[PDB]
Design a binder for this molecule. Structure first.
Ligand code: IES
Length: 127
């Protein structure tokens, strides 16, 4: 029933870089999604205590949210763009797994994912 610790956003043992693709992911992709009217439920880890969803972290074993992604991008946690893209995809997939089709939260996630894919289709090549 309690919340787990959030995903790691800092780790001195993990290798990291700044790439042009990761810069794009922060400045274009994350910025575009963050200001969407339906972004707010995804801006921090799912608080299963607040929501009284004691099964959330039984069903969802790889939690992810945009607050964590924003911290990882700003803290230069990632090695490459695919690590970040996978985090976004995990966030969407978790929502589709836990919730029913046609739930409001699923409609919200689908709106964000549509924008995400438009922006990722436009991902620049590596410098
Ligand atoms: C992502 C996901 O799958 N879920 C989820 C996750 C988080 C929340 C959620 C998130 C945040 C809060 N409230 C707060 O953090 C307090 C501040 C609210 C926002 C203030 C405005 C702002 O700062 N905007 O940027 C409550 C539920 C609700 C749902 C979903 N519940 C629900 O009623 O979602 C509606 C938004 C449709 C259930 C589900 C488990």
């Amino acid at each position: 029933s309690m919340n787990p610790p959030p995903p790691e956003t800092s780790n001195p043992n993990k290798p990291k870089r700044q790439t042009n693709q990761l810069q794009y992911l922060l400045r274009v992709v994350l910025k575009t999604l963050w200001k969407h009217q339906f972004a707010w439920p995804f801006q921090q880890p799912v608080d299963a205590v607040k929501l009284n969803l004691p099964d959330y972290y039984k069903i969802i074993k790889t939690p992810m949210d945009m607050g964590t992604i924003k911290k990882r991008l700003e803290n230069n946690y990632y090695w490459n763009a695919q690590e970040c893209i996978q985090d976004f995809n995990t966030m969407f997939t978790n929502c589709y797994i836990y919730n029913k089709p046609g739930d409001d939260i699923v409609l919200m996630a689908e709106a964000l994912e549509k924008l995400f894919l438009q922006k990722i289709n436009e991902l620049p090549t590596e410098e």
